Paper text:
Somatostatin (SST), an inhibitory hormone that distributes widely in both human central nervous system and periphery tissues negatively regulates multiple hormone releases (growth hormone, glucagon, insulin, gastrin and cholecystokinin) and cell proliferation through SST receptors (SSTRs). There are five types of SSTRs, namely SSTR1–SSTR5, which are divided into two subfamilies: SRIF1 (SSTR2, SSTR3, SSTR5) and SRIF2 (SSTR1, SSTR4) based on phylogenetic, sequence homology and ligand binding profiles. Here, we report five structures of SSTR2 and SSTR4 in different states, including two crystal structures of SSTR2 in complex with a selective peptide antagonist and a non-peptide agonist, respectively, a cryo-electron microscopy (cryo-EM) structure of Gi1-bound SSTR2 in the presence of the endogenous ligand SST-14, as well as two cryo-EM structures of Gi1-bound SSTR4 in complex with SST-14 and a small-molecule agonist J-2156, respectively. The overall structures of SSTR2 and SSTR4 possess the canonical seven-transmembrane (7-TM) architecture with an extended helix VIII in parallel with the membrane.
J-2156, a sulfonamide compound without the typical “W–K” pair, adopts a totally different binding pose in SSTR4 compared to that of L-054,522 in SSTR2, with a β-methyl-naphthyl which mimics the side chain of W8 extending to helix V and a phenyl ring on the opposite side approaching to a sub-pocket formed by helices II and III that is absent in SSTR2. The protonated amino group covalently linked by ethyl group forms a salt bridge with D1263.32, which mimics the side chain of K9 of SST-14. Owing to the rigid chemical skeleton of J-2156, β-methyl-naphthyl is compacted tightly with M1303.36, F1313.37, T2155.42, F2756.51, Y2766.52 and Q2796.55. Alanine mutations of these residues compromised the EC50 of J-2156, especially for F2756.51 and Y2766.52 which form extensive hydrophobic packing with β-methyl-naphthyl, and cause a significant reduction in agonist potency, indicating an important role of these residues in ligand-induced receptor activation. The phenyl ring of J-2156 is sitting in the sub-pocket formed by helices II and III, including V1032.60, L1233.29 and L2977.39. Sequence alignment reveals a remarkable difference in positions 2.60 and 3.29 among different SSTRs, which might be a key factor governing the selectivity of J-2156 for SSTR4. V1032.60 and L1233.29 are present as leucine and methionine, respectively, in other SSTRs. The larger side chains of leucine and methionine might cause spatial hindrance and be sterically incompatible with the phenyl ring of J-2156. Indeed, mutating V1032.60 to leucine decreased the potency of J-2156 by ~5-fold. On the other hand, small-molecule agonist J-2156-bound SSTR4 presents a sub-pocket formed by helices II and III which is disrupted in SSTR2, revealing a possibility to design selective ligand targeting this sub-pocket.
Numbering used by the authors:
A (entry chain S): 1 to 121, 136 to 247
B (entry chain A): 5 to 55, 182 to 354
C (entry chain C): 29 to 63
D (entry chain R): 46 to 189, 197 to 284, 288 to 320
E (entry chain B): 30 to 340
The structure:
């Protein structure tokens, strides 16, 4: 049973630090790349920091580069995120995501619950050209997304990830490599595209597919998510 | 592109490092293998350890780890799996001194001493264990000396005629097992007396495997 | 009859020889094994 | 008589050239830098060939009684000549220490005999050798011969004895202590394993570890004692003294790799 | 069959260039297997480690720490989810590659055999054929772990296995110079294959499915059929005085990959038994060999801890 619970419940005053914690359970925390994703109230996701197995590759986003610090503990299975020099734009959920990298892998599988922290008051741009699609169940729904750079590489695969976030829940992967569904997802999500334009078709929509869609690229750091296609009933 | 292949290479290089210590942890420890025919008397060598498919035993003595393997019951011919153990420190042998009079209960025409000696030559003269040392043990020395005062000992070797004393025969059969080997220029043969009395002969095999790993270290230095 | 049964391999080797990179020469760019 | 002196000059170069060409062949085709020892053997193998980059100039200039090439290149050829003889000395020293720590402390040498550390310590003694070689650049001059020029005799005396200790005395004492402790514990293991009689394998080692040290002396000590005769001489004692010193690195290929069964296999 | 096939001849000299060399192992390699994707291949070595190699980038996908270092066989399922490893311990520990955790967890252990496990091959995610050293083979499961069908018809020790394209019938040779075509549905042999004289070591099916190659330790290979069962050709030559450890076919079934244990491999003509290519470069005796289902490259494994990819 994979579980990613975060701690540090409480707003922070500008001019100090919070240094929240995140523990892991049900999986080998040492052999997974931990990601940090922020989400302000009704806003698009944004990658913050990523550490690999053994604290080897530690990347930060230009918004947090030089301000936030990530530190993991393999013997403790606990991820410490030291956040200093905070401001009002740091108000988000701070999702914690695990990821393992190999051929046929499923990156960004499990998302943490996140800590909704509030504060006392180039890069590949992923655009979806659509923010809200009010559609009741009864017909098929297809959601597209664009990219500033062509995601077609030389090896053959196209690195694209879809995430569905339900109201009050954490996102989870839909299709990795733009054509391969993750574990635990029925064959309803069919991903298509070529280079820049992409398509995610749903043959039959249920109460499980109603949420915000994100199209994230994993080409260059910092990682950028989609605009956010919200669904209504 | 280095998008996700860098993390894949970093993961591969991470387990490339992890597999390096595991190879070094397995290299610093002594890997031993013991053989023997029916009633080989292997209960002595497996009892000094501090602790279908073969049995494996771990025991650490004198700040040195030993990985001893017990063949046990293997109805399969050794020709198809004796090359897997090519690289052990010093293969162990366990011959019973009480096998000169009793014959094998297979065809009523083959002596146990000659059958064990035929297995010693089959294990020593092969294209796999040319360099690995052999450590043969003379089990049940009290049972052997009890029967030598009643038997002429000529049952096994008919061309022999000497004294029927333990110290004489233990040294005579020691040189006899040291004549069936043809690789006298590459491998070394050890001989010791093992029994329930005067036990704790692990100091002999500890000094024996120390001699082999140093001979292996001299090969590492390029001196042989 | 085993003589013509031996010739049955001609119907499978000569028909699948086009998609065999080992028997027929293939460019290095199409092969994923490149330096 | 310079006929026999010039004859052995080509003999040292020819016999050593075919020797190093065989060592380079048997290493990068069979060993392929397996561990630290084969990497250390590869160090002196190319250092001997780097030493053969200077032997055609010394043999021909000796017949010319001095150095007619120039001054800018002579200071460079003497630097690399002093660099390789420092490299060959430093190589045999740590290798003997590596051979000492490998047989005496097998569990401790498992972390130091890695191919990673072997390459760092390989060039690590290279930069350390230039550290003892750069004094040849601080006082490099040509006053027609092409030798070292010192302003005071006390400076020339303290310098030749500085490279006598850290270049000859201390390294030959290290290889002697390392090899003696190797055969010392090897004999101690013989008495503990029940082999009180000296076996043929240990006799082969004690003669090999003694041959490495005894040749290193009778080939470098004659080169060091004649330089002290230059400090305070004969016109026929310097020609063959360098010949036997140049024959050291020329006979080392057939001494360390040919005698051992690890390279010829 | 040399009187037939007058239209073909040895195609010059097959020169397969060494493209990739898998480094990282520290012991003797003994088994390997490929897949349809032809990018991930399993390999077993005497160091107690099961590595899932990446064929195109020479990277290690997984490093499974084996409990028994004396592993002699390993298999790669077509689903890419489970891999087996049998050896002297007779414990076919089938692991689970694609798991929810990071480390590879064992799915089911098979400790029902008595002889040494020689070869194992995955039929699917539910059935697996694993041979043993007690002169018999058995069909095993994963979710529960038992022997659905035990084939007891060989007088010698089985060494290798091979699966048909449909995985409904398989041939298997033993040390008694006897091979038998076993069935999976009813579970008994139809006709034996006795044409050799020494210990059969390697068995591999023909890509068409109506034939298979047999490799014994008498320095020769043979090609038997499944309809009339009579030897058509012999891969005998006086230049080979060594044994045989592996045999395989290409995608077209024309270039037979014979992994002789003389430190070099040989690419034999599968229709005329003529030396077409000699893959040399291995520093030790080869033990395993496998051709990808795509047919792009051929991986050869020796006891020098090196896995060479030929293309
Ligand atoms: C004890 C000692 C004395 C003198 C020098 S030294 O700095 O004088 N160099 C050496 C180089 C010998 N390999 C030399 O004795 N060189 C000759 C022969 C020669 C060499 C190259 C070109 C031409 C001739 C000479 N007459 O220069 C030393 C250098 C390093 C270490 C110890 C030294």
């Amino acid at each position: 049973d994979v579980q990613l619970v975060e701690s540090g419940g409480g707003l922070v005053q500008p001019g100090g630090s919070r240094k929240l914690s995140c523990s892991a359970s049900g999986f080998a925390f040492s052999s997974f790349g931990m990601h940090w994703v922020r989400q302000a109230p009704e806003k698009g996701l944004e990658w913050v920091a990523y550490i690999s197995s053994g604290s080897g590759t530690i990347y930060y986003a230009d918004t947090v580069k030089g301000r936030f610090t990530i530190s993991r503990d393999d013997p403790k299975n606990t991820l410490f995120l030291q956040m200093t020099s905070l401001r009002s734009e740091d108000t988000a959920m701070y999702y914690c995501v695990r990821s393992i990298y190999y051929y046929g892998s499923s990156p960004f599988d499990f998302w943490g619950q996140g800590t909704t922290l509030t504060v006392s008051s180039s890069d590949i741009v992923m655009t979806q050209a659509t923010s809200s699609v009010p559609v009741t169940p009864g017909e098929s729904v297809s959601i597209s997304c664009r990219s500033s750079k062509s995601l077609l590489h030389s090896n053959g695969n196209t690195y694209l990830y879809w995430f569905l976030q339900r109201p009050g829940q954490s996102p989870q992967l839909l299709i990795y490599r733009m054509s391969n569904l993750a574990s635990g997802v029925p064959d309803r999500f069919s991903g298509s595209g070529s280079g820049t334009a992409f398509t995610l078709t749903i043959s039959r929509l249920e109460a499980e597919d109603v949420g915000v869609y994100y199209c994230m690229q994993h080409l260059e750091y910092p990682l950028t998510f989609g605009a956010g296609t919200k669904l209504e009933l | 592109l280095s998008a996700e292949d860098k993390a894949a290479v970093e993961r591969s290089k991470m387990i490339d490092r992890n597999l390096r210590e595991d190879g070094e942890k397995a290299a610093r420890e002594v890997k031993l293998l013991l053989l023997g025919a029916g009633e080989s008397g292997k209960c002595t060598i497996v009892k000094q350890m501090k602790i279908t498919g073969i049995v494996e035993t771990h025991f650490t003595f004198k700040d040195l780890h030993f990985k001893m393997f017990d063949v046990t019951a293997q109805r399969s011919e050794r020709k198809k799996w004796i090359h897997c153990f090519e690289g052990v420190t010093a293969i162990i042998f366990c011959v019973a001194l009480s096998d000169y009079d009793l014959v094998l209960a297979e065809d009523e025409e083959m002596n146990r001493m000659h059958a064990s000696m035929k297995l010693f030559d089959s294990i020593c003269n092969n294209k796999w264990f040319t360099d690995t040392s052999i450590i043969l043990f003379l089990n049940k020395k009290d049972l052997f000396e009890e029967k030598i005062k009643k038997s002429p000992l000529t049952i096994c070797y008919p061309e022999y005629a000497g004294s029927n004393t333990y110290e004489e025969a233990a040294a005579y059969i020691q040189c006899q097992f040291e004549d069936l080997n043809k690789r006298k220029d590459t491998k070394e043969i050890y001989t010791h007396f093992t029994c329930s009395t005067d036990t704790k002969n692990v100091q002999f095999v500890f000094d024996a495997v120390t001699d082999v790993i140093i001979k292996n270290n001299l090969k590492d230095c390029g001196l042989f | 009859k085993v003589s013509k049964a031996a010739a049955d391999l001609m119907a499978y080797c000569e028909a699948h020889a086009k998609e065999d990179p080992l028997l027929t020469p293939v460019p290095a760019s199409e092969n994923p094994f490149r330096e | 008589g310079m006929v026999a002196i010039q004859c052995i000059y080509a003999l040292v170069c020819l016999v050593g050239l075919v020797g190093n060409a065989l060592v380079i062949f048997v290493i990068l085709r069979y060993a392929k830098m397996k561990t630290a020892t084969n990497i250390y053997l590869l160090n002196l193998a190319v250092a001997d060939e780097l030493f053969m980059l200077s032997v055609p100039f010394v043999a021909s200039s000796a017949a010319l009684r001095h150095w007619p090439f120039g001054s800018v290149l002579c200071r460079a050829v003497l630097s690399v000549d002093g660099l390789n003889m420092f490299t060959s000395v430093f190589c045999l020293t740590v290798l003997s220490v590596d051979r000492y720590v490998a047989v005496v402390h097998p569990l401790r040498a498992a972390t130091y005999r890695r191919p990673s550390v072997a390459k760092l310590i390989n060039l690590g003694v290279w930069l350390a050798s230039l550290l003892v070689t750069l004094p040849i650049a601080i006082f490099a001059d040509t006053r027609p011969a092409c030798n070292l020029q010192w302003p005071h005799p006390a400076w020339s005396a303290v310098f030749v004895v500085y490279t006598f200790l850290l270049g000859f005395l201390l390294p030959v004492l290290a290889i002697g202590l390392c090899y003696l402790l190797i055969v010392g514990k090897m004999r101690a293991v013989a008495l503990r394993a029940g082999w009180q009689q000296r076996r043929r394998s240990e006799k082969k080692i004690t003669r090999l570890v003694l041959m490495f040290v005894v040749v290193f002396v009778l080939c470098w000590m004659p080169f060091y004692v004649v330089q002290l005769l230059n400090l305070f001489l004969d016109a026929t004692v310097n020609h063959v003294s360098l010949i036997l010193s140049y024959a050291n690195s020329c006979a080392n290929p057939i001494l360390y790799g040919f005698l051992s069964d690890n390279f010829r296999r | 069959l040399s009187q037939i096939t007058n239209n073909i001849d040895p195609v010059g000299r097959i020169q397969m260039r060494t493209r990739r060399t898998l480094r990282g192992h520290l012991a003797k390699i003994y088994a390997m297997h490929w897949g349809t994707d032809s990018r991930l291949l399993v390999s077993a070595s005497q160091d107690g480690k099961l590595i899932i190699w990446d064929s195109y980038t020479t990277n290690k996908v997984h490093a499974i720490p084996l409990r028994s270092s004396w592993v002699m066989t390993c298999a790669y399922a077509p689903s890419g989810n489970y891999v087996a490893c049998g050896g002297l311990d007779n414990i076919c520990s089938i692991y689970n590659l694609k798991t929810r955790e990071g480390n590879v967890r064992v799915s089911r252990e098979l400790a029902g055999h008595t002889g040494y496990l020689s070869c194992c091959r995955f039929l699917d995610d539910n059935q697996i054929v694993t041979s043993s050293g007690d002169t018999t083979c058995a069909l095993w499961d994963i979710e529960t772990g038992q022997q659905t069908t035990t084939f007891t018809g060989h007088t010698g020790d089985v060494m290798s296995l091979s699966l048909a394209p449909d995985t409904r019938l398989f041939v298997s040779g033993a040390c008694d110079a006897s091979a038998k075509l076993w069935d999976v549905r009813e579970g008994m042999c139809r006709q034996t294959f006795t044409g050799h004289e020494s210990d059969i070591n390697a068995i591999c099916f023909f890509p068409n499915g109506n034939a298979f190659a047999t490799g014994s330790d008498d320095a020769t290979c043979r090609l038997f059929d499944l309809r009339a069962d009579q030897e058509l050709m012999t891969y005998s030559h006086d230049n080979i005085i060594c044994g045989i450890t592996s045999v395989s076919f290409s995608k077209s079934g024309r270039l037979l990959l014979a992994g002789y244990d003389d430190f070099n491999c040989n690419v034999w003509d599968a229709l005329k038994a003529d030396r077409a290519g000699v893959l040399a470069g291995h520093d030790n005796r080869v033990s395993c060999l496998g051709v990808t289902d795509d047919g792009m490259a051929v991986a050869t494994g020796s006891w020098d801890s090196f896995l060479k990819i030929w293309n």
